[PDB]
Design a protein around this ligand. Sequence first.
Ligand SMILES: [K+]
Ligand SMILES: [K+]
Ligand SMILES: [K+]
Ligand SMILES: [K+]
Ligand SMILES: [K+]
Ligand SMILES: [K+]
Ligand SMILES: [K+]
Ligand SMILES: [K+]
Ligand SMILES: [K+]
Ligand SMILES: [K+]
Ligand SMILES: [K+]
Ligand SMILES: [Mg+2]
Ligand SMILES: [Mg+2]
Ligand SMILES: [Mg+2]
Ligand SMILES: [Mg+2]
Ligand SMILES: [Mg+2]
Ligand SMILES: [Mg+2]
Ligand SMILES: [Mg+2]
Ligand SMILES: [Mg+2]
Ligand SMILES: [Mg+2]
Ligand SMILES: [Mg+2]
Ligand SMILES: [Mg+2]
Ligand SMILES: [Mg+2]
Ligand SMILES: [Mg+2]
Ligand SMILES: [Mg+2]
Ligand SMILES: [Mg+2]
Ligand SMILES: [Mg+2]
Ligand SMILES: [Mg+2]
Ligand SMILES: [Mg+2]
Ligand SMILES: [Mg+2]
Ligand SMILES: [Mg+2]
Ligand SMILES: [Mg+2]
Ligand SMILES: [Mg+2]
Ligand SMILES: [Mg+2]
Ligand SMILES: [Mg+2]
Ligand SMILES: [Mg+2]
Ligand SMILES: [Mg+2]
Ligand SMILES: [Mg+2]
Ligand SMILES: [Mg+2]
Ligand SMILES: [Mg+2]
Ligand SMILES: [Mg+2]
Ligand SMILES: [Mg+2]
Ligand SMILES: [Mg+2]
Ligand SMILES: [Mg+2]
Ligand SMILES: [Mg+2]
Ligand SMILES: [Mg+2]
Ligand SMILES: [Mg+2]
Ligand SMILES: [Mg+2]
Ligand SMILES: [Mg+2]
Ligand SMILES: [Mg+2]
Ligand SMILES: [Mg+2]
Ligand SMILES: [Mg+2]
Ligand SMILES: [Mg+2]
Ligand SMILES: [Mg+2]
Ligand SMILES: [Mg+2]
Ligand SMILES: [Mg+2]
Ligand SMILES: [Mg+2]
Ligand SMILES: [Mg+2]
Ligand SMILES: [Mg+2]
Ligand SMILES: [Mg+2]
Ligand SMILES: [Mg+2]
Ligand SMILES: [Mg+2]
Ligand SMILES: [Mg+2]
Ligand SMILES: [Mg+2]
Ligand SMILES: [Mg+2]
Ligand SMILES: [Mg+2]
Ligand SMILES: [Mg+2]
Ligand SMILES: [Mg+2]
Ligand SMILES: [Mg+2]
Ligand SMILES: [Mg+2]
Ligand SMILES: [Mg+2]
Ligand SMILES: [Zn+2]
Lengths: 83, 99, 138, 104, 208, 124
Amino acid sequence: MVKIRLARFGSKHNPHYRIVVTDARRKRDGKYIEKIGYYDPRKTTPDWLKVDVERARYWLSVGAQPTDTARRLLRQAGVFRQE
Amino acid sequence: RNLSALKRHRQSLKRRLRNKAKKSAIKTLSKKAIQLAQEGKAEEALKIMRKAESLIDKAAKGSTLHKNAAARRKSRLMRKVRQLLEAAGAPLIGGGLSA
Amino acid sequence: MLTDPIADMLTRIRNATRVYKESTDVPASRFKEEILRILAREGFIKGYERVDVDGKPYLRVYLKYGPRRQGPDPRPEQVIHHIRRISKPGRRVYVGVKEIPRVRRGLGIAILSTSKGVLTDREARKLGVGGELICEVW
Amino acid sequence: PKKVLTGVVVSDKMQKTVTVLVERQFPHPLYGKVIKRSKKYLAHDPEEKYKLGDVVEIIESRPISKRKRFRVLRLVESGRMDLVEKYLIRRQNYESLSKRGGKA
Amino acid sequence: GRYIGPVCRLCRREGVKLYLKGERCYSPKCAMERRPYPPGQHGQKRARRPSDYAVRLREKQKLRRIYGISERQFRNLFEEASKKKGVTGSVFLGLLESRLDNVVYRLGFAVSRRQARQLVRHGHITVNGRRVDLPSYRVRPGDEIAVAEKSRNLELIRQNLEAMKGRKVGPWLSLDVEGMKGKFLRLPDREDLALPVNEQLVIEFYSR
Amino acid sequence: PTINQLVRKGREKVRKKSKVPALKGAPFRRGVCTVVRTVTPKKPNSALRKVAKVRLTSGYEVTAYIPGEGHNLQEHSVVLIRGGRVKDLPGVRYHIVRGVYDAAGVKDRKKSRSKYGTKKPKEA
RNA sequence: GGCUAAUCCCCCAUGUGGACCCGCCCCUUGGGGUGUGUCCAAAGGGCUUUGCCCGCUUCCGGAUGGGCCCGCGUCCCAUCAGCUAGUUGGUGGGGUAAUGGCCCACCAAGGCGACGACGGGUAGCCGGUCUGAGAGGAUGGCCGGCCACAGGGGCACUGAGACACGGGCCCCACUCCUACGGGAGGCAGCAGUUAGGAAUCUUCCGCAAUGGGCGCAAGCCUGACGGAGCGACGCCGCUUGGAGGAAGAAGCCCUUCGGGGUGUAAACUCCUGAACCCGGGACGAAACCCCCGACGAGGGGACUGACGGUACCGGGGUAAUAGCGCCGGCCAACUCCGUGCCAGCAGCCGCGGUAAUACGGAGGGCGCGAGCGUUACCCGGAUUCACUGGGCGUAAAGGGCGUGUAGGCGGCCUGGGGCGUCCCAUGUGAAAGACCACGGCUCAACCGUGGGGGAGCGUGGGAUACGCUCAGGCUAGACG
RNA sequence: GUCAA
RNA sequence: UCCCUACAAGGA
Ligand SMILES: [K+]
Ligand SMILES: [K+]
Ligand SMILES: [K+]
Ligand SMILES: [K+]
Ligand SMILES: [K+]
Ligand SMILES: [K+]
Ligand SMILES: [K+]
Ligand SMILES: [K+]
Ligand SMILES: [K+]
Ligand SMILES: [K+]
Ligand SMILES: [K+]
Ligand SMILES: [Mg+2]
Ligand SMILES: [Mg+2]
Ligand SMILES: [Mg+2]
Ligand SMILES: [Mg+2]
Ligand SMILES: [Mg+2]
Ligand SMILES: [Mg+2]
Ligand SMILES: [Mg+2]
Ligand SMILES: [Mg+2]
Ligand SMILES: [Mg+2]
Ligand SMILES: [Mg+2]
Ligand SMILES: [Mg+2]
Ligand SMILES: [Mg+2]
Ligand SMILES: [Mg+2]
Ligand SMILES: [Mg+2]
Ligand SMILES: [Mg+2]
Ligand SMILES: [Mg+2]
Ligand SMILES: [Mg+2]
Ligand SMILES: [Mg+2]
Ligand SMILES: [Mg+2]
Ligand SMILES: [Mg+2]
Ligand SMILES: [Mg+2]
Ligand SMILES: [Mg+2]
Ligand SMILES: [Mg+2]
Ligand SMILES: [Mg+2]
Ligand SMILES: [Mg+2]
Ligand SMILES: [Mg+2]
Ligand SMILES: [Mg+2]
Ligand SMILES: [Mg+2]
Ligand SMILES: [Mg+2]
Ligand SMILES: [Mg+2]
Ligand SMILES: [Mg+2]
Ligand SMILES: [Mg+2]
Ligand SMILES: [Mg+2]
Ligand SMILES: [Mg+2]
Ligand SMILES: [Mg+2]
Ligand SMILES: [Mg+2]
Ligand SMILES: [Mg+2]
Ligand SMILES: [Mg+2]
Ligand SMILES: [Mg+2]
Ligand SMILES: [Mg+2]
Ligand SMILES: [Mg+2]
Ligand SMILES: [Mg+2]
Ligand SMILES: [Mg+2]
Ligand SMILES: [Mg+2]
Ligand SMILES: [Mg+2]
Ligand SMILES: [Mg+2]
Ligand SMILES: [Mg+2]
Ligand SMILES: [Mg+2]
Ligand SMILES: [Mg+2]
Ligand SMILES: [Mg+2]
Ligand SMILES: [Mg+2]
Ligand SMILES: [Mg+2]
Ligand SMILES: [Mg+2]
Ligand SMILES: [Mg+2]
Ligand SMILES: [Mg+2]
Ligand SMILES: [Mg+2]
Ligand SMILES: [Mg+2]
Ligand SMILES: [Mg+2]
Ligand SMILES: [Mg+2]
Ligand SMILES: [Mg+2]
Ligand SMILES: [Zn+2]
């Protein structure tokens, strides 16, 4: 089914993923459906994690299934908080 | 050599045969129906027509003839039968053709 | 029959000026007149006016020139140095507002015919419209 | 939106089918000059309703046959053999080119 | 690598004194004193009217030979300058003048440019307190160029910063002699520089 | 020509002909020597120019020049052609590369050494 | 041949509903609703085992993916001009998820072509890339998208999906096994061998990260991928030293034999200190899981690093790679000797036949520098296929002349339409790239984030000067 | 007869 | 080789 996962966009030893919505079957760095975030696993910037929290919701709402790592980042950005 | 996932081939054969079989039936009864319908044997032809209907939808339950393919078959049959019957005798067994 | 009455006029004017004529006639047409209107406004010509050479409508175009000059060949400068037909029958040229050309950093002009009427490049530009780029002049 | 094209009927020699000639003018990609090309469309006429010389609207349609993908929307005006003529003449010229030519 | 060879032989070819050694190019001997003519067996013969080309080339050579940069690096900066807004001539100059190895020299931490180079390569220098060993590092306005804490005791650095006592410094540069630290205030104006080079001819040399 | 004409016929892009059918327009093509003849220059010049008839791997047989003073080529020498004609000998359009295969590199060459394929001598 | 389990196969029931025929209604190509008739459902398993979890069935919808159709665009030859029988259309069938000569039966005799059909040659197409002031020319490796193929040809089965690269069947070629009847096989997956060639690499490490498949999970598989290896192949960074030092060593090169040059260059003094040696030593990795809470939100805890003892930090510390092309003009850089139309140079012009700045060597010089040259190819300069931007009296170029077909072009006035043309709004123009800005690796190359663009096409609205078209009129063109 | 000057 | 002029030729 469609997914929300990480696409590799950094460079050798300089990873930078794009939190993405794409068909599970597509190659990972291939044509995604929508960019909904980005993550710098090495926090080399105070902005190593950003998520279109609304947009995430949208897709989750229509079946998007997140990778475990993707889900993790989504939680961190408060995509699942209720209060 | 030796990729145990040639198990898929064995299955395909079993499946193939299982499919091939249901279809043969379908055809034979269908023909049978349009035949009797074409001979004015209303009650008899509708009787068989229903079998064919049933057998078709059943075929559609699984991969056999699954789909609108079933629908098409049913349609095309209830077509020929009702026409051939209109070309002479009234629908007795009320088979499946509606009022 | 003239193949292109506009080029014809533009030319009569080009020719006449080179032998420094005072006026010069041209078979009249409203469109043709509309062009003269600009020529006049812009001060390339003294002006024009209808007339009837043999009971047929023409347009006297009174030409302007510079002052007599110094040494050999005291012929005055031309007010209308350049005047070239652009869009032609057999190759019409149309331009969108963002493509109206800038004739000689402004020292010159371009006459386009637009649905809002015949205008100079600045006018057309100001009025936000394009059209058939008729001819340039400077 | 299904394309709607306007053209003239040049042929009704087909059962329920008329050939509609359609022109379009436009700037030449490099030379500017407005050039004018054309194309024939085989449109569907189930009622045989339209005739030779009719100017009609053609509309994008579900395939009716290999080669037939348009239906005759409506009659715009009719009786323009002039357009038919041109086409016919232009066609006449053809068989007057190759080693099989003929008239002057 | 850098040039690495007879340096005052260039002052000679360009007919104009360049300060490749800085010091000594002040003595009664930058050679520009004795034999201020081109190097080689013909350095004294009658010069021949140089070609429009010859002229621009020589002029570019001079400019680049001053900062002792490679033609490759040189050219790349120039291209960067063209693309950039503002007068290529001046901007190009600002950029050359922004090379750290250069600034170090401008602040006197070292006598010549070549020396100021080695001072960066050998870690003796610091931008905003962080060590930086790239001659080509681009110093920006605000950045403070200091002497490496651990090397503030080198005999060489002593004398050099000592001599800077009471010495003046470029308008775009500030210099606290005690704390052995300076500051790139702004990019220099063509006006601020006094180079024996008509940068205009260079822009030409590359437009060919 | 009129625009109409240009519309009808348009300009014609003309393609250039290769001066080096060393096929596959490769940069070099290998071959073997048929003849290791000698030739006389054209008009203004006069001398005994060295040449070679070469059977190419490109299934071609052409004459190639032998740059340099030295020269050790015989009727079966495997050699590498590099393209580049000799303006003095009509019909010679490729030079032989000295330093590759059976083509010895010019000896005692101290200047333009890279061309002529001559390794650096030990300075001493 | 015999036995047997199931989420395997079948029958009966239940009919939310759905399928089909006929009718009616709305809607308009086969969309939606309704009535009668007929037909069609299912699978169980796990526990923290009586109530939760994984799953099953029928249907409506979402989402993602995709099939099919249409306008426009997409190389060279007219020394290819006529092409066509499933050919073009029809009716009725078959087929499919679905339209369609897609296929078939029968009827009609059509369809296409100079706006280039048919034939021949060449070729995966695009985002883009190179070049250019631009218009344009050339191009399509890497990366992303689409297509096609999996030794050559054909075919279908299974399935949501294939006519399936590591599935199946037959024919052909080839290799191999063979007890000669008959079998096995397909690297255009990674790595590697061999052949061809001017030429293109490791039979490496790992599953730690991202991603994929199956599984409740633990986890398994993953030559996808993350890394390391080899090659100046490319781009970027860096080193071979820094300061001082003679009216100037020696050698070598010149010489008017007075001297000039190599040159502060070396030697030598002082200084720093690439390499190397000690020590410390990482981000990338926090999830899945587990406990609390409710298997949710939320909180707490544990495990995991190929790269690698690598990066980076600190201590110590040696003065230690320079080459290649060129110096007649174009084009920066000159003298001696050798040679004597020879040996040879040569991109074009050209140079060598006794004093050659052009050959070969040396000294000197210029250019660039871990590179420098060469060859090949592309754009440029080339307004030298000219649209921007050219020409044809004598330079290449007016057809021997005419008639007239298609086509291109069309005087003056008014009106309608609004096709061309212009304007507004709106959709589209994926990412990467390109441009600007800020930012992360000490810089940069490289990379991240953000911003600005855009022609073309679709849609709605508008304008009407010019062109077009329709309607009427005029007489200056034409004809009588 | 040929190259050059 | 020489004569011829740097050669072709011709000449010893
Ligand atoms: K669905
Ligand atoms: K679709
Ligand atoms: K292309
Ligand atoms: K292109
Ligand atoms: K260290
Ligand atoms: K040393
Ligand atoms: K020389
Ligand atoms: K070129
Ligand atoms: K002629
Ligand atoms: K003729
Ligand atoms: K009107
Ligand atoms: Mg299995
Ligand atoms: Mg049977
Ligand atoms: Mg004119
Ligand atoms: Mg003029
Ligand atoms: Mg008809
Ligand atoms: Mg049909
Ligand atoms: Mg600039
Ligand atoms: Mg052109
Ligand atoms: Mg000669
Ligand atoms: Mg049995
Ligand atoms: Mg079942
Ligand atoms: Mg119900
Ligand atoms: Mg049942
Ligand atoms: Mg049908
Ligand atoms: Mg059907
Ligand atoms: Mg067909
Ligand atoms: Mg056409
Ligand atoms: Mg063809
Ligand atoms: Mg091909
Ligand atoms: Mg150009
Ligand atoms: Mg194939
Ligand atoms: Mg095949
Ligand atoms: Mg193969
Ligand atoms: Mg095969
Ligand atoms: Mg199936
Ligand atoms: Mg297959
Ligand atoms: Mg394989
Ligand atoms: Mg080989
Ligand atoms: Mg590799
Ligand atoms: Mg993994
Ligand atoms: Mg995983
Ligand atoms: Mg395995
Ligand atoms: Mg890899
Ligand atoms: Mg290589
Ligand atoms: Mg020194
Ligand atoms: Mg794990
Ligand atoms: Mg020179
Ligand atoms: Mg000799
Ligand atoms: Mg040479
Ligand atoms: Mg480098
Ligand atoms: Mg051109
Ligand atoms: Mg040419
Ligand atoms: Mg032109
Ligand atoms: Mg010309
Ligand atoms: Mg002549
Ligand atoms: Mg002539
Ligand atoms: Mg004539
Ligand atoms: Mg005509
Ligand atoms: Mg008109
Ligand atoms: Mg017309
Ligand atoms: Mg009108
Ligand atoms: Mg319109
Ligand atoms: Mg737009
Ligand atoms: Mg946008
Ligand atoms: Mg984009
Ligand atoms: Mg930075
Ligand atoms: Mg960006
Ligand atoms: Mg519109
Ligand atoms: Mg003779
Ligand atoms: Mg000669
Ligand atoms: Zn000096």
